[PDB]
């Protein structure tokens, strides 16, 4: 599938293998991967995510199709719920025949994703979720009301 | 209309310019209305009809 | 090691696993990978590479240390000799605490690499190497004599 | 001095401004001198001494 929403930590080994096999089956020459890994900050146990799935799907589908028009396959996976320290919460791949478009979409996608994907992050501390307000990004049209 | 609250917002979804004023009187939302974007039927806006669902989206941080 | 020169095709599975383990052991949160895969063009059997190893080492060591100053681990591996269609010939990783510097070095490195790494590419056709003149990039100070 | 030829260049390395003129008279090099960069002792240049090694580097294409 183009967008994968996974409960808990991503199986990056399995995802990376599948993506590469696709790269080879499509005779691709360039393969760009990003993996977001939960790191230990202070003494958190990990992170937790909420996802607006319907909007995430449509938002991402526009990026997937913009990529396809340029000969690039763009796919992603993201965790839902708890992800512990050392585990992966987000992964994306941009691959194609040539490195130039693949690398450009990769950069552009990741930046857009950070600021616009409808996903909410919480620090896991003491088995409690603390919303990460200071680090968060207002969506377009914030403060409408 | 239905009103749904995503992410950190505490309020439970319910079914109650005249949408603004009513949400502006709920105190669990004073923290939020200044920074929340809105989706009408899963589409961000910046008209209304029966069964319309309105979603409040606080600042995001995927990754 | 920081730079790996491998005879033949890269074992990307093994390299990616090792790099990730390092990412986790260093409590990194961002992991960027590029893999260059030999694709079938026309009816070539694959590609073959010559490497100026001493100069490649020093050239790359400057990039590794520029990366380190920014809190980013930058490593690479590249094939020497024959690499068949479907096999990987080049791999690099840029990883660190934060995505911003890691992604910037990744972009900048790959572009510099393409134009400046002392490596020569040949198409493998009929068991013969054909130099890829048209696609190649003159080094700084070309035509000195 | 030693002269080494990297990549596509056919010539075998040997041990023979006065380096330019001599390479400029070898015909296996007419194809090459216009586009080759030069490293003196593994360092690109754009003086000489005994045991100096001079390396010719044709256009590159790693990846």
From TrEMBL, chains B, D:
Pfam families: ThiS. Signal peptide: none annotated. InterPro entries: Beta-grasp_dom_sf, Mopterin_synth/thiamin_S_b, ThiS/MoaD-like. CDD domains: Ubl_MoaD. This is Molybdopterin converting factor, subunit 1 (MoaD).
